[PDB]
Amino acid sequence: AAPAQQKTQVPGYYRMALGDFEVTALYDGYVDLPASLLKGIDDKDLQSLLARMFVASEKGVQTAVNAYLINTGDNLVLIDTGAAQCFGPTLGVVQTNLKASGYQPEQVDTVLLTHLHPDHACGLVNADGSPAYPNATVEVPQAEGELLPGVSLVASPGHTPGHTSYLFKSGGQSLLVWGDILLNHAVQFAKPEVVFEFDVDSDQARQSRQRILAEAATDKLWVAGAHLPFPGLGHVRKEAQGYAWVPVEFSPIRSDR
Amino acid sequence: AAPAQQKTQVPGYYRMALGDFEVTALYDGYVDLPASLLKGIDDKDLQSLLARMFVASEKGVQTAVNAYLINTGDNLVLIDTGAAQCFGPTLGVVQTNLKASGYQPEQVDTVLLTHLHPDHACGLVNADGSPAYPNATVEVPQAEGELLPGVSLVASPGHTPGHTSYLFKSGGQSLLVWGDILLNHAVQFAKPEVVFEFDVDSDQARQSRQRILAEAATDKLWVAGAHLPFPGLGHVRKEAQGYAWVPVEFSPIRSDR
Ligand SMILES: [Zn+2]
Ligand SMILES: [Zn+2]
Ligand SMILES: [Zn+2]
Ligand SMILES: [Zn+2]
């Protein structure tokens, strides 16, 4: 006698203030990744780490893919673009969420890619072959502020040779849109030594991860992570061993802050 | 040259499957609570606990107020109703989010109150004096399933004498909509001994909290918490000392699960 269930999820966007900038986190969808792709750890310990965060793995680890839209006043900047249809119908929702968040793709004047992997770059092209962001300058990493006012490059090579993170600064606040520094929040904060099979260079990716985590924890900066649980926004805390992820708490943007 | 900032936040609803039931978490807004209202802990340790979770306290702890709408197939059930205008304009958004989530208040056939505090009960009445949920049977705690199919009472006295939690079970899964078992996730999971000044009976509230946390951790049940960071959904994990909150990871409702 209840009405039919609605099913539908809330739209995959989330707003956060960062000084005078506005951050809109955008969800692309998810992909199931086998836990066996994580290496450098015993099966038992891996499963314990997953169970600790109540992450199911029997049918693979459901992994989020996020992109970030930052309105700096000077520019509307999109970092990564999701996967379009490259990895199937559970992904490709970034542009839809961009629209849901109150912007249009024609407004994006800059697209920054952390790296060229499908789940970051395929979203540049619509199903009919038309450019998803037709008015944007697209920045591809090489295998005021600096790049733009308030926006600078933070090299983070390893996952791919040209893998790059982007730093946004406004009003004393900093946000690092870090790309694929890590793929599994339940394992690689606690044990950054753990690597991903599809890191092009796993040793290097691991070195960059250790460094970036140390810096993020030390400087208490905000992090925006392509494969962290959506909205993928939060801080890194140093633990006795390894690190912990602290996600932002849902909040409207406050005028009195 | 960027467009104007949108400001607006994504609507405050979140969908989760629980067996054959559908859970819609609903955000009422927030209230700033002084950290001085938490007792049983030194100032220093309290501040350390807050800083650990990156919770600002200089202007009070911004605290979420959540309600929960569960479609059990048999009933559309709302647990708590937010504050309406009882605590000012930063609250009172539950009904708005209920509408945003695709339901209408006329559809709610049952309202369960965890307790009679303003931030749970004031939402029963619209600004013009009309009933917010005019077709609902309202269950006030006394100072199949059992109450309804799949729905049972879990007494949790202390915060108020009649304070009550509600258990929903479907398809082997359980969700406890627990009310005000705790008020600050950054302090009272790690240190359940810490009490709230406006618990009517702080010793009793603390006993109920210890018991409920132990049970939630042991039985691995889902928890829906009125003052946990929205959507307020997740699990409780037992630590060497005290407990930890593990929030659900954003996900659509999956057909293949
Ligand atoms: Zn990648
Ligand atoms: Zn990726
Ligand atoms: Zn209360
Ligand atoms: Zn309350």
* CATH number assigned to the domain comprising residue A192: 3.60.15.10
B87: tokens are 């605590």
CA-based R_g, chain B, Å: 18
Ligand-binding site membership of B32 (annotated): no
CA distance A67 to chain B (A): 14
Question: Residues with Cβ < 8 Å from A256, sequence gap 6 or more?
Answer: none
CB contact under 8 A, A2 and B71: yes
Neighbouring C-beta atoms of residue B74, cutoff 10 Å: 17
How many Å apart are CA B194 and CA B183, to the nearest integer?
A: 10
Q: Which residue has the tokens 């039919």?
A: A4
DSSP letters spanning B189-204: TT-TT-EETT-SSHHH
List the one residue out of A62, A65, A89, A56 whose CA is nearest residue A12: A65
CB contact under 8 A, B6 and A101: yes
How many Å apart are CA A67 and CA A233, to the nearest integer?
A: 11
Q: What technique determined this structure?
A: X-ray
Burial of B88 (0-12, 13-18, 19+ CB in 10 A): exposed
How many Å apart are CA A121 and CA A210, to the nearest integer?
A: 25
B228: tokens are 């946990």
Pairing state between β A137-139 and A110-112: parallel
Q: Where are the alpha helices (DSSP H) in chain A?
A: 43-52, 94-100, 118-121, 185-188, 202-218
Contact residues, chain A, for B13 at CB < 8 Å: 10
B60 CA from centroid of ligand 4 (Å): 16
A162 CA from centroid of ligand 2 (Å): 13
Count of all residues that appear for chain A in the document = 257
How many Å apart are CA A99 and CA A106, to the nearest integer?
A: 10
Do A112 and A70 contact (CB within 8 A), yes or no?
Answer: no
Using CA atoms, how far residue B109 sits from B93, B132, B137, in Å, is 20, 12, 6
Q: Which of A3, A13, A246 sits opposite B107 (nearest CB)?
A: A3
B19: tokens are 């067996």
HSE-CB of A170 using CA atoms within 13 angstroms: 19
Per-residue DSSP letter, A48: H
Beta bridge partners of residue B26, listed in sequence order = B13, B67
Pairing state between β A195-196 and B233-238: unpaired
A123 CA from centroid of ligand 2 (Å): 12
Pairing state between β A173-179 and B21-33: unpaired
CB contact under 8 A, B14 and A12: no
Resolution of the entry in angstroms: 2.1
A206 CA from centroid of ligand 1 (Å): 14
How many separate domains does chain A show?
1
Q: Which residues, chain by chain, have CB under 5 Å from ion ligand 4?
A: B 117, 119, 180
Domain that holds residue B204: 1-257
How many Å apart are CA B240 and CA A131, to the nearest integer?
A: 53
In degrees, rounded to 5, the angle at the alpha carbon of residue A139 between the alpha carbons of residues A135 and A145 is: 100
How many Å apart are CA B222 and CA B253, to the nearest integer?
A: 16
Which helix H or strand E contains B216, and what residues bound it?
helix B202-218
Do B66 and B91 contact (CB within 8 A), yes or no?
Answer: no
Contact residues, chain B, for A55 at CB < 8 Å: 249
H, E, C per residue of B29-88: EEEEECHHHEECCCHHHHHHHHHHCCCCCECEEEEEEEEEEEECCCCEEEECCCCCCCCC
Residue of B nearest to A100 (CA): B10
Residue of A nearest to B97 (CA): A10
Contact residues, chain B, for A7 at CB < 8 Å: 15, 22, 253
Q: How far apart are the first and last CA of chain B?
A: 45
Question: Residues with Cβ < 8 Å from A56, sequence gap 6 or more?
Answer: A50, A62
Beta bridge partners of residue B174, listed in sequence order = B169
How many Å apart are CA A75 and CA B18, to the nearest integer?
A: 42
How many Å apart are CA B180 and CA B178, to the nearest integer?
A: 6
How many Å apart are CA A85 and CA B154, to the nearest integer?
A: 46
| Dihedral sign of CA atoms A184, A153, A107, A254 in order | positive
Contact residues, chain B, for A235 at CB < 8 Å: 54
Q: Where are the alpha helices (DSSP H) in A157-240?
A: 185-188, 202-218
Which helix H or strand E contains A15, and what residues bound it?
strand A13-18
List the one residue out of A14, A11, A9 whose CA is nearest residue A228: A14
Contact residues, chain A, for B101 at CB < 8 Å: 6, 10
Judge if the upstream peptide bond of residue B231 is cis by omega within 30 degrees of 0. yes
CB contact under 8 A, A75 and B109: no
Per DSSP, the three-state class of B131 is: strand
| Residue A67 Cα to chain centre, angstroms | 6
Do A160 and A118 contact (CB within 8 A), yes or no?
Answer: no
Do A106 and A97 contact (CB within 8 A), yes or no?
Answer: no
How many Å apart are CA B120 and CA B117, to the nearest integer?
A: 6
How many Å apart are CA B94 and CA B83, to the nearest integer?
A: 8
Classify each residue of A211-221 as buried b or exposed e, where b means 16 or more C-beta atoms within 10 Å of its C-beta.
Answer: ebbeebbeeeb
Residue of B nearest to A22 (CA): B5
For chain B, how many helices (H) and strands (E)? Answer: 5, 14
B190: tokens are 């790690």
Ligand-binding site membership of A227 (annotated): yes
How many Å apart are CA B137 and CA B118, to the nearest integer?
A: 19
How many Å apart are CA A26 and CA A11, to the nearest integer?
A: 9
CA-based R_g, chain A, Å: 18
Please tell me the number of the ligand nearest to residue B63's CA: 4
Judge if the upstream peptide bond of residue B118 is cis by omega within 30 degrees of 0. no
Ligand-binding site membership of B185 (annotated): no
Q: Which residue has the tokens 């770059």?
A: A121
Q: Which of B9, B13, B64 sits opposite A15 (nearest CB)?
A: B9
Contact residues, chain A, for B75 at CB < 8 Å: 1-2
Per-residue DSSP letter, A36: G
CA distance B254 to chain A (A): 9
Torsion of CA A2, A8, A13, A17, to 10 degrees: 0
